[PDB]
Design a protein around this ligand. Sequence first.
Ligand SMILES: [N+]
Ligand SMILES: [N+]
Ligand SMILES: [N+]
Ligand SMILES: [N+]
Ligand SMILES: [N+]
Ligand SMILES: [N+]
Ligand SMILES: [N+]
Lengths: 123, 120
Amino acid sequence: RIPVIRSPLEIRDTERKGRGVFALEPIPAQTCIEISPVLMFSKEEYEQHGQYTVLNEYTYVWSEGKQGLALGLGSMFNHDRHPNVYWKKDNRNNYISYYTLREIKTNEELCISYGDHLWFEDE
Amino acid sequence: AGHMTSMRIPVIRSPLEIRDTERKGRGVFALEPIPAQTCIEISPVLMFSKEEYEQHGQYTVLNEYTYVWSEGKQGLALGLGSMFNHDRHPNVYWKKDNRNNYISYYTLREIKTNEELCIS
Ligand SMILES: [N+]
Ligand SMILES: [N+]
Ligand SMILES: [N+]
Ligand SMILES: [N+]
Ligand SMILES: [N+]
Ligand SMILES: [N+]
Ligand SMILES: [N+]
């Protein structure tokens, strides 16, 4: 249900800024760069406990107020005002797919929006 | 002396696939043979402090996936690290990088097309 993607990404990991996902080489617009399996938290367990951990930096809203943590690279993308990556949530398959929003140049950081949303590509 | 640290870690693109399994939920499977001692995955570790784990994290599904780390901390392997099933007869070993908060996973032997990769 989820194979290797094989995209020209690296993680950069600095004392200063922590971790981020960066382009090794130019990437075409609308290229799927990552498919991340999700670790799912129930609504109750995230409200009672999960939200008071560092999970609160990274998780995404899911259906019925459940909360998902993207494994793979998905939690590593930083947020920016001008993101170059967008994503789609798949409810049936419990993953999140990441796509380039435009052509990406070599050495650019791959960033997502600050904002979340709740709809699913399989709905 | 010195300066701040700065690392560039590639994303190892191994011939692996996640599949749902019969009993064990998701697991990791080989798509083609893999030599012995090939590094198949380098997972960044999301670190939980002793306190947030003891007070909150252990009460969540995190408890099913995290690795005991030093000083009462618990590490959740991002990447594919949390997707390996555990096994009696594992064909994968791992090691922690305590300096940088990664876990690396290596095949214990030749892996065959369709075999499940399992740790302990
Ligand atoms: N899957
Ligand atoms: N609260
Ligand atoms: N996010
Ligand atoms: N789009
Ligand atoms: N967004
Ligand atoms: N609890
Ligand atoms: N191990």
